[PDB]
Ligand binder design. Structure first.
Ligand code: CL
Length: 199
C-alpha cells in the first residue's frame, strides 16, 4: 500500500464516504472540508450533537465542559470523518494511527480545555456503560482536564485512542497536520499527506 495509492482517499470506517468528493453543504465546524470531503452532510451535523451518535460517547460525563473546549472536540471529529488527507496514517474496518498534529493544534486544544472536567486519563476503555452512554466508573473523581491530561500531548493522544500524535513540529513546517483551518486559506494538510506518501 503506497504512493499515490494513499492520497485523496477515505478510510474504510463505518461512516466514511467511499471516496472523497465536494459537498455543497457541510455543517459549521466541518465547513473547511467542503471542497473535498470524506463526510456527508448528515455526518457533519451528527458531529455537532450534544452526544454524537457517530460514537455514542459523551463528552459531558463530568457535567462541566466549556464551550471553547467542546469546540475543539467537534473540530477533531470533522477532521477524522471529513479529511481526504489521512491516507498515509490509515492502518487495518480501517482506522488511523498517530496522525501527527501540529504543536499549536494540541497546545490550543489543551489550553482551552484546562478549566473543563473529566474523570479518566485514558478514554479508550473502562467506562461504565449502563445508559448506552458512558459514565464515570465508581471511584473515578471528576477533576480538571489539566489533572488527567498533564500535557497537550496527553490530551491529543489519549482522547482519540492514538488516532493522533502530538507532533513536535509546528504549523506550516510541512511535517504536521492541522485538525482545523480557516476555509479561506486553503487546506494546508494536502501538502503534508503528499510528502509522507512519498518517503
Ligand atoms: Cl485535511
Amino acid at each position: 500500500p503506497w504512493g499515490d495509492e494513499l492520497l485523496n482517499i477515505c478510510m474504510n470506517a463505518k461512516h466514511h464516504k467511499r471516496v472523497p468528493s465536494p459537498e455543497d453543504k457541510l455543517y459549521e465546524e466541518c465547513i473547511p472540508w467542503k471542497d473535498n470531503a470524506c463526510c456527508t452532510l448528515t455526518t457533519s451535523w451528527e458531529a455537532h450533537l450534544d452526544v454524537s451518535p457517530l460514537y455514542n460517547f459523551s463528552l459531558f460525563h463530568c457535567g462541566l465542559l466549556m464551550p471553547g473546549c467542546r469546540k475543539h472536540f467537534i473540530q477533531a471529529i470533522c477532521f477524522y470523518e471529513c479529511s481526504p488527507n489521512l491516507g498515509p496514517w490509515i492502518q487495518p474496518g480501517e482506522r488511523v494511527v498517530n496522525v501527527p498534529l501540529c504543536q499549536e493544534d494540541c497546545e490550543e486544544w489543551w489550553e482551552d480545555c484546562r478549566m473543563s472536567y473529566t474523570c479518566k486519563s485514558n478514554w479508550r476503555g473502562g467506562w461504565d456503560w449502563s445508559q448506552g452512554k458512558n459514565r464515570c466508573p465508581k471511584g473515578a473523581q471528576c477533576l480538571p482536564f489539566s489533572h488527567y491530561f498533564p500535557t497537550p500531548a496527553d490530551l491529543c493522544e489519549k482522547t482519540w485512542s492514538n488516532s493522533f500524535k502530538a507532533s513536535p513540529e509546528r504549523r506550516n513546517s510541512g511535517r504536521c497536520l492541522q485538525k482545523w483551518f480557516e476555509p479561506a486559506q486553503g487546506n494546508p494538510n494536502v501538502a503534508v499527506a503528499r510528502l509522507f506518501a512519498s518517503e
